[PDB]
Design an enzyme around this catalytic site. Structure first.
Site, PDB file in Angstrom:
ATOM      1  N   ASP A 154       0.840  -1.193   0.000  1.00 17.03           N
ATOM      2  CA  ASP A 154       0.000   0.000   0.000  1.00 17.03           C
ATOM      3  C   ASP A 154       0.877   1.247   0.000  1.00 17.03           C
ATOM      4  OD1 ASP A 154      -1.895   1.919   0.328  1.00 17.03           O
ATOM      5  OD2 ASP A 154      -2.412   1.376   2.387  1.00 17.03           O
ATOM      6  N   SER A 177      -0.634  15.560 -12.033  1.00 12.92           N
ATOM      7  CA  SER A 177      -0.884  15.201 -13.417  1.00 12.92           C
ATOM      8  C   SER A 177      -1.135  16.462 -14.237  1.00 12.92           C
ATOM      9  CB  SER A 177      -2.089  14.261 -13.485  1.00 12.92           C
ATOM     10  OG  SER A 177      -2.502  14.016 -14.814  1.00 12.92           O
TER      11      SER A 177
END
Length: 330
Positions: free
Chosen positions: A35, A199
């Site tokens: 994770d 992004s």
């Protein structure tokens, strides 16, 4: 040193991935959920409340000659899906794919929430976010990667998750045969303890690319892709009959639909998520309403590039003094 381990989807939807981890001496192999959005290595154990164990493999520290109670240490964690676990702490030898760390904090669960009990395939979590998020008190502990870093050939790990198929976590090296083209690296902020990046935009299907900054985290422990409501609405508007359902808890779509791809930007590069990766199947057995793999982050407080996005890429988690992320197509 290096390590390399195969990671395998827990079910036919890729809801999560499990990777075998050797703990203790002799080894006890548990299948952990790696994770990159958390920083605790915790396991079902011989200390877990018996009624909260249902099919998981447990760690028994009393059977490990290298286990040592970390005196006074406790831990307690809550995840973004509302699940939680807590317990005490041992140090022990932990190996992943041939890479060994001695003295790793292994957090033994005394209590786990119902969603953990109900999932027999996940024996615990191995956190790969920054150690500043580790919950052990009163002495915070380091992640497996942080402990291994100095020994690794290069201070990196890579995630290569499969679509409906196994993939690979590598530690200490870049496998240049595992991706196509080049890896585009992008800046990371560690201020929230995550692999947080920005992004450069998105496209829906064959549509034009929208240049827009989307800050979010690379999180292998989250199944879906959680993005701003504007972006998510633009995606699902291209699927006839798709709608946000408050009762189901997100966007659903007719199972008869063919889903468009979704592209996200990494610098000037583009990662394309095929439409099929966005199908999470019937909302309940036999239903013709299917659950979408792109959902709004509006109620989270952060955008999350979970498995839906990451499995479309070869992803480099570069833990150099100034961390960065790399993405390549594959």
């Amino acid at each position: 040193s290096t390590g390399s381990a195969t990671t395998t989807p827990i079910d036919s939807l890729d809801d999560a991935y499990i990777t075998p981890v050797q703990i203790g001496t002799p080894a006890q192999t548990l299948n952990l959920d790696f994770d990159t959005g958390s920083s605790d290595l915790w396991v079902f154990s011989s200390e877990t409340t018996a009624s909260e164990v249902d099919g998981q493999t447990i760690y028994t520290p009393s059977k490990s000659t290298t286990a040592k109670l970390l005196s006074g240490a406790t831990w307690s964690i809550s995840y973004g899906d509302g699940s939680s676990s807590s317990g005490d702490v041992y140090t022990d030898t932990v190996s992943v794919g041939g890479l060994t760390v001695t003295g790793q904090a292994v957090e033994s669960a005394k209590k786990v929430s119902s969603s953990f009990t109900e999932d027999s395939t996940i024996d615990g979590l191995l956190g790969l976010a920054f150690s500043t998020l580790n919950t052990v008190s009163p002495t915070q502990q380091k992640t497996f990667f942080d402990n291994a870093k100095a020994s690794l050939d290069s201070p990196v790990f890579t995630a290569d998750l499969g679509y409906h198929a196994p993939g690979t976590y590598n530690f200490g090296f870049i496998d240049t045969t595992a991706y196509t083209g080049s890896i585009t690296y992008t800046a990371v902020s560690t201020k929230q303890g995550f692999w947080e990046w920005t992004s450069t935009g998105y496209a829906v299907g064959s549509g034009t690319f929208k240049s827009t900054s989307i800050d979010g985290i690379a999180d292998t422990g989250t199944t879906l892709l959680y993005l701003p409501a504007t972006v998510v609405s633009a995606y699902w508007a291209q699927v006839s009959g798709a709608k946000s359902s408050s009762s189901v808890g997100g966007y659903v779509f007719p199972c008869s639909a063919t889903l468009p791809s979704f592209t996200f930007g990494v610098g000037s590069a583009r990662i394309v998520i095929p439409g099929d990766y966005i199908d999470f199947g019937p909302i309940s057995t036999g239903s013709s309403s299917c659950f979408g793999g792109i959902q709004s982050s509006a109620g989270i407080g952060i955008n999350i590039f979970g498995d839906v996005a990451l499995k479309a890429a070869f992803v480099v988690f570069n833990g150099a003094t100034t961390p960065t992320l790399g993405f390549a197509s594959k």
